[PDB]
Design a protein around this ligand. Sequence first.
Ligand SMILES: CCCCCCCCCCCCCCCCCC(=O)OC[C@H](COP(=O)([O-])OCC[N+](C)(C)C)OC(=O)CCCCCCCCCCCCCCCCC
Ligand SMILES: CCCCCCCCCCCCCCCCCCCC(=O)O[C@H](COC(=O)CCCCCCCCCCCCCC)COP(=O)(O)OCCN
Ligand SMILES: CCCCCCCCCCCCCCCCCCCC(=O)O[C@H](COC(=O)CCCCCCCCCCCCCC)COP(=O)(O)OCCN
Ligand SMILES: CCCCCCCCCCCCCCCCCCCC(=O)O[C@H](COC(=O)CCCCCCCCCCCCCC)COP(=O)(O)OCCN
Ligand SMILES: CCCCCCCCCCCCCCCCCC(=O)OC[C@@H](O)COP(=O)(O)OCC[N+](C)(C)C
Ligand SMILES: *[C@@H]1O[C@H](CO)[C@@H](O)[C@H](O)[C@H]1NC(C)=O
Lengths: 214, 496, 80, 150, 86, 96
Amino acid sequence: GQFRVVKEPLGFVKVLQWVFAIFAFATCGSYTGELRLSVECANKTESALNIEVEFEYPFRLHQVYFDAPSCVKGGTTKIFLVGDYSSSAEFFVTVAVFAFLYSMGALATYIFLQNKYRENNKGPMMDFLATAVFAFMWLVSSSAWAKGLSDVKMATDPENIIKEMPMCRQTGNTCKELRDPVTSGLNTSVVFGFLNLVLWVGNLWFVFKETGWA
Amino acid sequence: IKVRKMKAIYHTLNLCNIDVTQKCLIAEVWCPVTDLDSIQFALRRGTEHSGSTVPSILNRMQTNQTPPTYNKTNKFTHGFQNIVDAYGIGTYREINPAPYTVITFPFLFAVMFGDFGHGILMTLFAVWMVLRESRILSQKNENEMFSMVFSGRYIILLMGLFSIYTGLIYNDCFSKSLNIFGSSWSVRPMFTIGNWTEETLLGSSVLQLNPAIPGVFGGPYPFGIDPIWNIATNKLTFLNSFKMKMSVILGIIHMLFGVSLSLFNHIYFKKPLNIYFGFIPEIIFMSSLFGYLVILIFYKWTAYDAHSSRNAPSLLIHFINMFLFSYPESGNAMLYSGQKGIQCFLIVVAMLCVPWMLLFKPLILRHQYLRKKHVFDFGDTMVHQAIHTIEYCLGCISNTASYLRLWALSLAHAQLSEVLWTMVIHIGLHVRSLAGGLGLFFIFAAFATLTVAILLIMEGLSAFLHALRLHWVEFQNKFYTGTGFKFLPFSFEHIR
Amino acid sequence: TAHSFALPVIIFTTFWGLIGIAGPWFVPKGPNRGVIITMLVATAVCCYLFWLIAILAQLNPLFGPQLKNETIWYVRFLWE
Amino acid sequence: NNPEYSSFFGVMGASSAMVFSAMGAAYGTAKSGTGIAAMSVMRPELIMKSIIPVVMAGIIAIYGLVVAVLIANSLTDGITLYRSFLQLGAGLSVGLSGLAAGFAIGIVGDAGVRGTAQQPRLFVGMILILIFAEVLGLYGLIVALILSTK
Amino acid sequence: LCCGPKLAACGIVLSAWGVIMLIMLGIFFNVHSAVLIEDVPFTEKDFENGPQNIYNLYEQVSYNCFIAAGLYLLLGGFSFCQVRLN
Amino acid sequence: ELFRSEEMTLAQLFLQSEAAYCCVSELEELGKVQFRDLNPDVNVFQRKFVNEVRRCEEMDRKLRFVEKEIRKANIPIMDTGENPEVPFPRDMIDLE
Ligand SMILES: CCCCCCCCCCCCCCCCCC(=O)OC[C@H](COP(=O)([O-])OCC[N+](C)(C)C)OC(=O)CCCCCCCCCCCCCCCCC
Ligand SMILES: CCCCCCCCCCCCCCCCCCCC(=O)O[C@H](COC(=O)CCCCCCCCCCCCCC)COP(=O)(O)OCCN
Ligand SMILES: CCCCCCCCCCCCCCCCCCCC(=O)O[C@H](COC(=O)CCCCCCCCCCCCCC)COP(=O)(O)OCCN
Ligand SMILES: CCCCCCCCCCCCCCCCCCCC(=O)O[C@H](COC(=O)CCCCCCCCCCCCCC)COP(=O)(O)OCCN
Ligand SMILES: CCCCCCCCCCCCCCCCCC(=O)OC[C@@H](O)COP(=O)(O)OCC[N+](C)(C)C
Ligand SMILES: *[C@@H]1O[C@H](CO)[C@@H](O)[C@H](O)[C@H]1NC(C)=O
């Protein structure tokens, strides 16, 4: 066991990359949000005083639905959220999962087969290739996840939901919110993605130096 | 091997002159120009081995006899070269259809056999044959069918690849689409802006969808046919038209490429007569009558949308009216301003190209070969040119029609795959009880055998041979002659 | 689900144009340079024509898909 | 509203698409089997290669079955005269096209099995003719798929 | 149980095809792909409240597909053992 | 290349009889030469070397018979891959 390899600056970078994107996977893939609204129609008896909705991490929001009040005859109209950002959320989650698996494999190789990894610099070259690929993936995914988080905050926003709801277009109907989703998890995930991108960018130079191309 | 070569060599020397004329043997041979030095070096080896002091001597001589057709075939190009040679060995030094066939035969095959899954199966099979080719080449068998397929392994490989591509474009995989980017058809705007409700869903068995209301149709699918058409009962209504237009477009462009190749042939052979009467009249006729049809198809696609659906003209009727000069004041309106004048001009040019081909060339030939220098038979020449013009003009129509076999075979393959799926593995999938997972075993065994037999083997063979027929007739009648002789060298194949 | 007809057309046109135009200048020199160039150009032309026909045929639909009521009900929930 | 007899034409179209295709494929199979039996007494090694025309007759039968199944799954109680007669036309198209294609396949295969027995090179020519004979019935099926889903 | 190598090869190729295609079909059913809605064995009652019932039936069909894939995996293993025997 | 057929040309060779066999053997190995009948007046079955070709055919028959006995027996037939040239000198007597 070459624990000195882990303790070395490159090993520290690998350990940091393992902890990061794993923090991101935990923050994102475990995200579960709830929203609460209320509608008081012209007749109070038909008021939807409390309507609650829940959504998961994948952000397939267009699937999420709820039976809002119609304010006429006491009926209900099914309303769905607008747009989904799975293409970005799942992409970032998969990138983070792949990064975590690669970090675990690299740590295992350095601890056990560091000599084989360093042999002929072929392992350093493969590490440099993976580092460039991961840097590009992180650069794309950080922006994708930030845009997804902003647009999800917009779409899940009770203000926007009420504005789009046709109940407000009626006479006397009043729609209000009760709670908003916790954006702390999404913000932390975005910050962790940016940190992982920075770590990969920094490790690019370390890999280049190790491979001798410096 | 020793005795077989010895026999072959003596039988070859039989063909050479004998001492009845000279003690030194006389040999006559065809040879490519570049290999003359190599042949001389081979003769030098022969002299050294025989020990004869005198050296054998080779000599060129300007000739009149027709040289053979030699194509310097390769391992990858052997299948395609045999494929194009089947319908007649090309003449000496004319545009060879093989290099273009190398792609257009797999592509035309894929336009019909288009299916992602079946293409995957075919490319895997062709890759197995390619990889294990040395093994099978060593282990020879008498199975004619298998020998044919193996010789065509590269043909099958390219056919599989292009079939994969066309299956992706059709969004077809074992009769089922993919939806990898997301459909442009959203059903919610129908209830939001449109006039629907759960009551309408209960009341209508099949209903329908419209893109006129804003959010239903969010642009075209970025790559291939939209997945929703797979589940739409309106599938055929749209696929039929799209595939008919595709078939006509591809056929007309292929024929135009053939005519350009014919121009190349004439330029190389130095037949300005053919270039100025023949090709140019032919290309003008073809483009004006049928290329204009492709332009019309593309223009209608780009112009007419849902809002203008009501008064969207039918290009079939418009082409009929173009030919009949039957532009009416009632019915579907004109596609674009000036259609009457432009179409009349196009028809006039098209019909003028018939006299252009027919009358001109015979008259110039008769002039410059019977009034100058003074056997030429003017009546026979006129009859021959009339036959050629009638043949070409009727051929344009009949070939643009026959290229519809692309759509016919594609739709047939798609419908046969759909019915096979729904009649075989729908049985194993539409079972509530978990015990169905065991039934799916045998049901899918039947599905696999049926796909390999009915579809991969027989429908694939039909599509292959119809791409072949298209290439032989529709494409190659424009520039190919195929009145040469295969170069059969004195090469030792007794290795068998 | 808004599928703009700018990104797909630009991406596919540039990709197939590269394959069919730049690739002939990159093919290595040898006996098969001509045949390989022909395959590159012909594949570019054919594949691009097929894809363009498909995308245009889908563009500007004069009628929408006809979906059974069960599948319309399911698609409302699932698809965007 | 609609006549109680409106479904008769659709039912008969499905029945025709099946029956006439079956008759054409039966003729193809019978003629090809006669040719194969006559040939095999001298060239036993060509039976498997020469079994192709029988397979193409089976393919004609398969087209007939497909169109019959489509029409039979499209029949409904309130089937209007329009749909009923569309399905009748599709059935007639498939049935008669498969009938004629099967006749041609049977005759050509009976000729070409014996011919290939004598001249090995004739096998590919026989296959070439047979594929045309089969796509005749395919054209019938194509028109049927256009009609029954008009 | 010795048998013909041709039959063993056919069995193994069919096993590979079945495993791959049925695994993909199960994955798609589990993802609830709307393309395969016709293959779900649902009834009129399943359209009562929401899509959860149809999702459950999708999952059931996916389980059937995975069971078939596992059976074909066993069949391919038997064919591979027969090949090793031959 | 495959664009169009190769430039083709006739040629005629004077070669002394003694070395003619070896020279045509080298040509056969090379494979880029196509001879033509230059004595079509007399049929093939009467040409000069018909005696030689007849004896070669008899040798081929002998080899076919021995090979058939080989197949009848379980003994296998080797495969080296060498392609030696027929001996131009009168090694036919030794082979016979
Ligand atoms: C798991 C299954 C996956 C699917 C795989 C099968 C896909 C279905 C389509 C395959 C069609 C195969 C035919 C084309 C290949 C032959 C072309 C070629 O390159 O050879 C030149 C062939 C044969 O090669 P050749 O012997 O001429 O080679 C040249 C040799 N010299 C120069 C010495 C003469 O040449 C021709 O005669 C050209 C005409 C070919 C026309 C093809 C006719 C149809 C043949 C049908 C084959 C049998 C049907 C399938 C049965 C399967 C069951 C065992
Ligand atoms: C799935 C979606 C995509 C589908 C559409 C694209 C399909 C393209 C199909 C062509 C690819 C396969 C080519 C054959 C591979 C086997 C090689 C055989 C032997 C070989 O090297 O052939 C040479 C001919 O050139 C060659 O082998 C040609 C190689 C280079 C061709 C480049 C053109 C490829 C297509 C365009 C680019 C890709 C587009 C899709 C992304 C000459 O034979 P030899 O010297 O070895 O012979 C040895 C004895 N004489
Ligand atoms: C080897 C290759 C051989 C050739 C292959 C190609 C086939 C060639 C066919 C013949 C020549 C080209 C076609 C000529 C016929 C007219 C084509 C009209 C196309 C069309 O629909 O355009 C609309 C009309 O254009 C207008 O409104 C403008 C006026 C009408 C058209 C003017 C002529 C344009 C073509 C010029 C010749 C091109 C030659 C190509 C070889 C666009 O108009 P819109 O929708 O905006 O208007 C509508 C409201 N008013
Ligand atoms: C509207 C849709 C349809 C459009 C189709 C027409 C437009 C595309 C084709 C236009 C012509 C392209 C260029 C022609 C060849 C010019 C010669 C130089 C080409 C080049 O750089 O490569 C040389 C090899 O070319 C060669 O060996 C020959 C290359 C020939 C390229 C064209 C063949 C594909 C056309 C068919 C399209 C597919 C069918 C459409 C349905 C290298 O020079 P080198 O050293 O090899 O010297 C030559 C002898 N060896
Ligand atoms: C022997 C050699 C081996 C042969 C190999 C053959 C492989 C064949 C495997 C497939 C066969 C079955 C075909 C079924 C295809 C339908 C599956 C499908 O549609 O996929 C995609 C769906 O999951 C997703 O789409 P959705 O959930 O509707 O929408 C959500 C999609 N967004 C998020 C992108 C918008
Ligand atoms: C009623 O239905 C028609 C026909 O589809 C539609 O155009 C119109 O917008 C609808 N009116 C409403 C929902 O008020």
